[PDB]
DNA sequence: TTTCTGTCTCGTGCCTGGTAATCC
RNA sequence: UGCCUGGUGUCUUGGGUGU
DNA sequence: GGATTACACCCAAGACACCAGGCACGAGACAGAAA
């Protein structure tokens with residue numbers, strides 16, 4: 001048999017942190033835990049007890065001029081991106097810049113060659129799911145007013161048809177819950193719909 | 208305001224039923240309230256409470272009053288209600304019971320007032 | 321974590337993964353911290369919802 | 378009633394043993410806890426049952442059998458009612474009468490009131 | 491342990507006269523021995539006795 | 540192909556995402572990567588995906604067999620006969636295709652399974668092929684006297700346990716260090732245990748459950764480098780006693796096995812873990828054998 | 840007297856059972 | 864980086880307080 | 883013979899399985915005995 005096998009840096013790291021070198025390397029986003037906040041750096045801890053630090057250039061955005069302590073405090077965990085890993089010393093440096101924490105989405109290295117990958121199908125499914133995300137729900141509006149009636153434009157005109165000239169009805173507007181359509185009889189078989197824009201609304205159903 | 212400053216609160220109860228104690232919470236300012244939660248706030252003015260003196264001989268011995276928070280350590284009554292309670296101020300003690308629901312509050316304010 | 325089911329004797333299992341709240345931390349898509357027992361809803365897919373039982377990676 | 382109250386069920390042949398929730402133990406001091414009265418009475422009943430079973434299989438002088446079975450009857454009866462007029466009550470080692478189940482339910486301090 | 495504070499006790503477990511005390515404070519410190527558990531496995535003498 | 544279940548369940552993090560839209564993958568290259576085909580089959584069995592085998596030149600074979608079968612007549616009667624023959628031939632192809640697809644699928648499945656079986660065999664052999672540690676100035680195969688030190692986790696209240704075993708494989712003495720491992724008292728007590736009691740271990744093993752064990756390893760290495768704790772050699776550059784990390788799958792499984800409890804009824808779990816580490820250093824093969832059924836649950 | 844030791848008393852330990860009206 | 868605790872006998876008896 | 887005799891509240895103080903006697907494990911001391 002071969003002599004006793006001595007663990008190396010990668011094997012020791014995997015044994016201690018129970019995290020593989022592949023799953024913990026450059027270009028990965030992990031929810032680290034803030035442990036100490038300082039003006040020039042922030043000391044954070046990962047899930048696997050790996051102590052990390054970030055130099056002041058990356059805790060806050062380059063455009064912002066605030067203080068690290070005001071924005072982030074102890075116990076406020078944030079997402080971070082791995083920049084460097086000291087496997088021997090179990091030390092890592094992180095970045096809070098959104099160019100890493102947000103843009104890194106397709107982190108897999110799957111070969112997307114059109115000859116062997118159906119890019120068109122994945123794209124089509126992508127707009128399908130994005131349109132599904134765009135899909136929402138809407139409901140009717142209820143208002144309490146003596147001259148308010150939940151009628152269509154033609155319905156309001158027909159309701160005012162049986163009434164003499166000058167009678168007024170109020171119905172929801174098609175421009176949104178912040179708009180109100182008022183229909184009044186200008187003349188026999190002649191009606192005017194006037195849109196009213198609402199400001200400082202307490203509620204969608206409120207006036 | 209917390210459980211030591213009036214007006215304040217003692218607990219925050221989530222939808223699932225878990226109770227958040229505000230004495231032992233270090234991040235009380237970091238609590239956001241969602242609709243449907245319950246806040247066990249302090250007793251405030253105009254809260255209906257049932258008020259009682261023993262022995263309860265008749266149904267006028269339990270009546271619902273409106274709370275007014277005052278200093279010092281005694282319950283205070285308008286003197287006209289000392290007749291139905293058969294109470295005077297030579298050392299008598301009386302019991303106060305707090306309703307814990309909207310239904311019970313409505314019952315107290317509409318029936319026993 | 322893969323989504324499959326296994327059957328093993330109690331001896332074969334390594335040990336329970338005792339994790340403190342300083343270790344069992346979850347962050348949602350928007351970056352807001354979510355703790356144990358909270359209710360979250362899937363952003364896409366079946367869009368299901370439920371209470372968190374355990375958080376790992 | 379044939380379904381619910383059959384006459385021969387008025388004679389006890391098997392005894393139900395209540396859970397410890399009914400007869401909780403109390404810690405008298407920091408070290409020694411105290412068994413409840415019902416627990417001691419059930420222990421006495423079970424000892425009498427063991428004694429009857431042992432006596433029956435070994436050797437049967439009718440006088441001894443009558444004495445031991447009458448002791449078992451007394452223990453079972455006093456476990457449920459310790460105020461039977463016409464005979465002495467069951468006493469604890471401290472000299473106080475045993476608090477039977479019937480005594481738990483009656484009076485101002487009983488279960489119902 | 492009681493939820494009060496033990497910081498007002500002296501070395502002998504007794505408070506000293508002249509000390510202001512409030513409700514639930516500990517004025518007498520007393521402990522009773524308990525048979526130790528298997529915590530001697532890996533506890534550095536920090537096991538409850 | 541993807542079913543609706545496949546359309547919804549194959550997420551960018553799921554292992555099935557590697558072949559969510561694969562197309563025209565060569566069969567001959569599959570045998571070199573058996574796990575991809577195995578995972579495709581597993582996803583198919585879950586009702587998510589559908590695996591299809593197709594030939595670019597299927598029309599060529601159909602036309603060639605038709606030309607062999609078709610008649611050379613040009614009359615309308617011959618045209619009708621040729622049409623009937625071609626339609627029957629197309630129906631025969633429709634019936635025949637699924638069976639051939641299934642046969643080819645089974646053949647590739649067997650090939651990939653055999654390849655992965657051989658790969659797992661080689662991985663296991665590599666895992667279990669290691670002779671015991673050879674102390675210096677000794678021939679290969681000699682069983683060394685070993686000392687294991689461990690504390691497990693390193694939280695406040697984590698004493699360091701020490702277990703020493705001789706070359707005979709029998710436990711000789713177990714010691715507790717109840718002071719802080721960073722104190723001078725810890726180092727002095729460890730030095731006294733190492734030297735005074737004539738223990739003279741040939742190699743010292745250190746292991747744990749987290750990164751806190753690294754500090755203990757560094758402290759022990761510094762102590763060894765400072766006190767010059769050279770190995771005793773039976774009767775001159777005396778060599779230092781080596782301190783290394785130890786793989787502990789077998790130790791972790793041994794600390795929970797009832798075999799240790801029967802063997803050591805009055806010992807802590809950490810003592811059993813240290814004994815397992817020491818036995819693994821003495822003889823990895825026997826420790827791997829001791830797993831019995833739990834060896835199959837190792838990450839091979 | 841020096842030295843190996845016996846073996847029977849004895850300290851430490853423990854099991855477990857004996858022992859006031861009234862009223863219907 | 865050293866890091867925070869809710870858990871309180873029972874049974875008798877006596878003396879009191881307001882009606 | 884049996885059953886029941888106002889309501890609520892406060893505080894303090896004294897008692898609550900003890901024991902003894904027969905069975906086991908370990909130890910040790912002072913006296914035996916060869917030299």
Ligand SMILES: [Mg+2]
Pocket residue numbers: 294295296297298299881
């Ligand atoms: Mg009075």
